[PDB]
Amino acid sequence: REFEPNDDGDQSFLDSPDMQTKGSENAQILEQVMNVHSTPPGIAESHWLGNFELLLLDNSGELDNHSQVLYDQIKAHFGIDSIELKKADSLIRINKMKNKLNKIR
Amino acid sequence: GNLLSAFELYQRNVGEWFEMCRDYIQDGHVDESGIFRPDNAFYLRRLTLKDFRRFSLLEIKLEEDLTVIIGNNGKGKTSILYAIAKTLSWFVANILKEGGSGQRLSEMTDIKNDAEDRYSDVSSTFFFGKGLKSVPIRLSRSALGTAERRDSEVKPAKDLADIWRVINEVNTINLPTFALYNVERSQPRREERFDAYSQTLGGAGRFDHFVEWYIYLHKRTVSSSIKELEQQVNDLQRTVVSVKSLLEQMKFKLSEAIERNDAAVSSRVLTESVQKSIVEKAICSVVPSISNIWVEMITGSDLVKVTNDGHDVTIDQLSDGQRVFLSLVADLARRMVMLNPLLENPLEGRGIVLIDEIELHLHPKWQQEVILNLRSAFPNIQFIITTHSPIVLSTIEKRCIREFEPNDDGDQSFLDSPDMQTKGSENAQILEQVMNVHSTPPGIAESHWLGNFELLLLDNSGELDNHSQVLYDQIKAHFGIDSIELKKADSLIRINKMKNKLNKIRAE
Amino acid sequence: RREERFDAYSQTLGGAGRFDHFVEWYIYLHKRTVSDISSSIKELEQQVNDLQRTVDGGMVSVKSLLEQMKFKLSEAIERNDAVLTESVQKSIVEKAICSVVPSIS
Amino acid sequence: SWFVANILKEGGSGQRLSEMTDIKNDAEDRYSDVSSTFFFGKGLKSVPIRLSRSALGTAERRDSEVKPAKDLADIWRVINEVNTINLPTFALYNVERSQPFNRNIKDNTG
Amino acid sequence: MRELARLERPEILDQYIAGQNDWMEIDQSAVWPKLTEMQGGFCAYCECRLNRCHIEHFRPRGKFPALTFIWNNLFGSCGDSRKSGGWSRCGIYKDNGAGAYNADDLIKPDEENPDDYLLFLTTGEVVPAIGLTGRALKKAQETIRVFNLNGDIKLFGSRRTAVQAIMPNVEYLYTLLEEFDEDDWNEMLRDELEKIESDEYKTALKHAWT
Numbered sequence A: 001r002e003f004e005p006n007d008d009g010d011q012s013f014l015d016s017p018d019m020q021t022k023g024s025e026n027a028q029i030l031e032q033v034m035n036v037h038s039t040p041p042g043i044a045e046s047h048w049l050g051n052f053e054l055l056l057l058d059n060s061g062e063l064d065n066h067s068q069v070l071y072d073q074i075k076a077h078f079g080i081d082s083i084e085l086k087k088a089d090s091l092i093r094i095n096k097m098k099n100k101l102n103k104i105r
Numbered sequence B: 001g002n003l004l005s006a007f008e009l010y011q012r013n014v015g016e017w018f019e020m021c022r023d024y025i026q027d028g029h030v031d032e033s034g035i036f037r038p039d040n041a042f043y044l045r046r047l048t049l050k051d052f053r054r055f056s057l058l059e060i061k062l063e064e065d066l067t068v069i070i071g072n073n074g075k076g077k078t079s080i081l082y083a084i085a086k087t088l089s090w091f092v093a094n095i096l097k098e099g100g101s102g103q104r105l106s107e108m109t110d111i112k113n114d115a116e117d118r119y120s121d122v123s124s125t126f127f128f129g130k131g132l133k134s135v136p137i138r139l140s141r142s143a144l145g146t147a148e149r150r151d152s153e154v155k156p157a158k159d160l161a162d163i164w165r166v167i168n169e170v171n172t173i174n175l176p177t178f179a180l181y182n183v184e185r186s187q188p189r190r191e192e193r194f195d196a197y198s199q200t201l202g203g204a205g206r207f208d209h210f211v212e213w214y215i216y217l218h219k220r221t222v223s224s225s226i227k228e229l230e231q232q233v234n235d236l237q238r239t240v241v242s243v244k245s246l247l248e249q250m251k252f253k254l255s256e257a258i259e260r261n262d263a264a265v266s267s268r269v270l271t272e273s274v275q276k277s278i279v280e281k282a283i284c285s286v287v288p289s290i291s292n293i294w295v296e297m298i299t300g301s302d303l304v305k306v307t308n309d310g311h312d313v314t315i316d317q318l319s320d321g322q323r324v325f326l327s328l329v330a331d332l333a334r335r336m337v338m339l340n341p342l343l344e345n346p347l348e349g350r351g352i353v354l355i356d357e358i359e360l361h362l363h364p365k366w367q368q369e370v371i372l373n374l375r376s377a378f379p380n381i382q383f384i385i386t387t388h389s390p391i392v393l394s395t396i397e398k399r400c401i402r403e404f405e406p407n408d409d410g411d412q413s414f415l416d417s418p419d420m421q422t423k424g425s426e427n428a429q430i431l432e433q434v435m436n437v438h439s440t441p442p443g444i445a446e447s448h449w450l451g452n453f454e455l456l457l458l459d460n461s462g463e464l465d466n467h468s469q470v471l472y473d474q475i476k477a478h479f480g481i482d483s484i485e486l487k488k489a490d491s492l493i494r495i496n497k498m499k500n501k502l503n504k505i506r507a508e
Numbered sequence C: 001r002r003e004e005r006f007d008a009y010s011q012t013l014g015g016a017g018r019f020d021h022f023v024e025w026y027i028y029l030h031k032r033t034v035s036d037i038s039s040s041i042k043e044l045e046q047q048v049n050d051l052q053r054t055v056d057g058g059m060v061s062v063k064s065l066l067e068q069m070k071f072k073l074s075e076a077i078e079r080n081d082a083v084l085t086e087s088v089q090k091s092i093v094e095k096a097i098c099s100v101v102p103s104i105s
Numbered sequence D: 001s002w003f004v005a006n007i008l009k010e011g012g013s014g015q016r017l018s019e020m021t022d023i024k025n026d027a028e029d030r031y032s033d034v035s036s037t038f039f040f041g042k043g044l045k046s047v048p049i050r051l052s053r054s055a056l057g058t059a060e061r062r063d064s065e066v067k068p069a070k071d072l073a074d075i076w077r078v079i080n081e082v083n084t085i086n087l088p089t090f091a092l093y094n095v096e097r098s099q100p101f102n103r104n105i106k107d108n109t110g
Numbered sequence E: 001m002r003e004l005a006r007l008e009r010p011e012i013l014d015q016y017i018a019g020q021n022d023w024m025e026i027d028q029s030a031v032w033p034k035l036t037e038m039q040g041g042f043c044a045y046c047e048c049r050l051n052r053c054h055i056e057h058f059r060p061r062g063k064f065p066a067l068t069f070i071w072n073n074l075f076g077s078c079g080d081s082r083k084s085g086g087w088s089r090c091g092i093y094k095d096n097g098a099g100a101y102n103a104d105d106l107i108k109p110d111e112e113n114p115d116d117y118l119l120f121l122t123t124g125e126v127v128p129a130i131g132l133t134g135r136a137l138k139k140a141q142e143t144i145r146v147f148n149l150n151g152d153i154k155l156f157g158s159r160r161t162a163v164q165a166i167m168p169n170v171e172y173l174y175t176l177l178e179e180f181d182e183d184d185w186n187e188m189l190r191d192e193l194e195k196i197e198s199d200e201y202k203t204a205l206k207h208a209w210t
């Protein structure tokens, strides 16, 4: 039963969540039921992968000087075996392949 | 620049040695960021525990700024903080009084129950600049009924505390803050400078104390030579009906000025107006979603009010978790202002602050914010904290973290940093890689279905057989049509179909 | 609540009175009267007028205080200007006490 | 509290709403109600209880309606007196449960 | 956010006239099936699967009482006036939460293609598209802000998670471009882009695939 009162503290009914919680991942419950980001928004490093992606898309998928610097920062901070670095690597691979297709066309 | 030698020469004799001691304590610089930095930092460097509670032998190296201790219930996180607080009690006692006695280990509870040698040792090494690189202290206790007693070694703590006390007596200096905030923080004469050390290592950070104090400060600071003030009081007295309130205010101001004049160098303190302002700034800087705090008396009762998430509300509208945190910060700020009167920003003073279970009573939302600003508001405090929260850990660098291994039977020698970087990482990863907790509850059958579904797909060369279809339908029925679990299942089907198509093309 | 009208019946036949309730109620009345800005303006206006008379009488030492009070008055007037029943209640009780209790003026 | 009181004693009183803290400050009607409905098998599908309190000086009093709870608690009490039966457990565990332990423990008064 | 094709107008809007009639009067079950034909059972702005859903006036009835019973102006948005909890994106937030906005500086998905203005990153943010200036930037920015397409944690989460589920399949297709002839690989991508019309957050999945 979810208790979200108004600014005056008054509420009429308590609702069940829309998502099934039993056996679900905790990260999903955080976001879908407790309304909290799974990654801390106040930490700059939380935005690096997003920024990295945007830089890659701005330079037609090629690692420029700026994108390389940020890549190196991600590698240095999260480590060689980090999920974040794997995602970055994935982004590079996909975008390079997409660009190659675009050039063929 | 050996501080102890300079002080010994001062005590035997004289102005030059005094000045050297005072400069060692007081000299500092403002860094690039505009923050004052003492030239000679004070912090706990190392802690060793021998046959103490669950620990046969444990060694911890601490960070200068922030150390976070993590582990399951009963791993000894609170025990570590208790050990440090007892050690710090010896500094506090001797700053207050020559030959003052700090606290001691319990002979009933603190000795490890299966210690063959029936005594316990808590050994701490402190650092105070390059002049005093090592200040070792040992607290010891022998078990009840042991023939041979083991003595604590506290003289270095006393010696250092003596320097602070004696130099301060002659000329006011800034003093280190020591505070412990345990889980009990949640439970429901004029002000002297050294009241800052009262109940600092137990009893600190109660909401009621703050509210009372804050209203008091407000009433005093609602609405200047002594001779001039004396003349003004005399002129107002001669005039005295409508000016009687003003006369009483001026008499109070005169009395305060005389008191300050009469008060000693060792108890020199900032004005109540300044004290109030600094604490308000501390609260608003540190406490998440409080932007403003003030006292109203319009309704006819004294109310502390706050601007919480952009709405002006009474402080009694805050959750218990948010009140307890506000109390902690207010209390800390108050002590720092009293102990650091010579600093432009008194919150840039030195000290060691211990916090047990920092996330106590906090909703996940404010767990994501609490540590961000603590270090920015108190830049020269060494914080030693304990937590169970992955959300808190997501805001802290791995170098600050010390973790107990899950299989630790109390024999292990060192606490170490986790392998994975926590700061900026996803919650699920911290849970699995740092806290050893699965993303789905193992005790629920449905938690295994997607994993099992994947295995079934892989067993049947990627084709959706009768068994895989049944489980798919179960997943769909239980979690729903737009569930993450079902989407992952769908993804698996699609990728396996594509893999098989590739395999057929290659075979032909 | 001491301001609630029917609190007047609280322990009324207990034998002692409730002098504690009086003191609480009286402080309450005071806070409300001080918080009312127009009475504060009127009081401040009266204080400024009294201080101006003293400065006109040759006491140059109180000129600094007059300037401070004039500033406070101007600020109070500038703040959004609108008789408190609480003010009248307070006056009635004060007069009663002073009239009946001989040593208290 | 009304079940517990009446299992212990005929005519036992449970707890009451406060006139000071329990009534909403801006209530037009100037009274408060806490209404509960309990289930006890298909033979007693509805056991309604209401706890009420009015503000001082209101023209009408709002009284609590506790009789069904008392009647049910009386069955448990009386039947138990004649022949032992199993009885329901009621308990509240607040955040107050986190308190320190007094190691020194009292002799068996009985 | 999708490019919508508004094609046929329902009969009931002819009967009711602005000024005389109120929106409380009109029957809503007549209006829905034409929107559900346009919108595919998905939200106009965010691309939820609609289950708690309302009719939204793109230009509101307060500011524009002339534009009330107009087939252009109506859209099926996620959310509900009735049920407890203040809904925090789309229709409901545009009115209550977004506050001050010029309705001229918003993407109208029946009229315009959103794809030239909006970009969906695979990390789950929606951002202005690569290289916009002046008005084109200002529409992209205000659409994102007013419909709360990033700031609704529930929405930001759902979209991020939906995309991250498919990113093994995207990765894997663009490896096989090496080996196959063009017409087979172009059929594969055509097939995957066909599937995602049945899916939630279809625009964000497109940008991942294409």
Ligand SMILES: Nc1ncnc2c1ncn2[C@@H]1O[C@H](COP(=O)(O)OP(=O)(O)O)[C@@H](O)[C@H]1O
Pocket (backbone or CB within 6 Å): B052, B053, B054, B071, B072, B073, B074, B075, B076, B077, B078, B079, B080, B109, B110, B111, B112, B113, B114
């Ligand atoms: N004297 C002792 N001898 C042995 N084990 C002890 C002793 N005192 C406490 N313990 C153990 O220490 C643990 C409690 O440590 P504590 O710091 O309170 O845990 P936590 O890490 O949860 O804060 C428990 O496992 C308890 O059994």
Ligand SMILES: [Zn+2]
Pocket (backbone or CB within 6 Å): E043, E044, E045, E046, E047, E048, E077, E078, E089, E090, E091
């Ligand atoms: Zn929507």
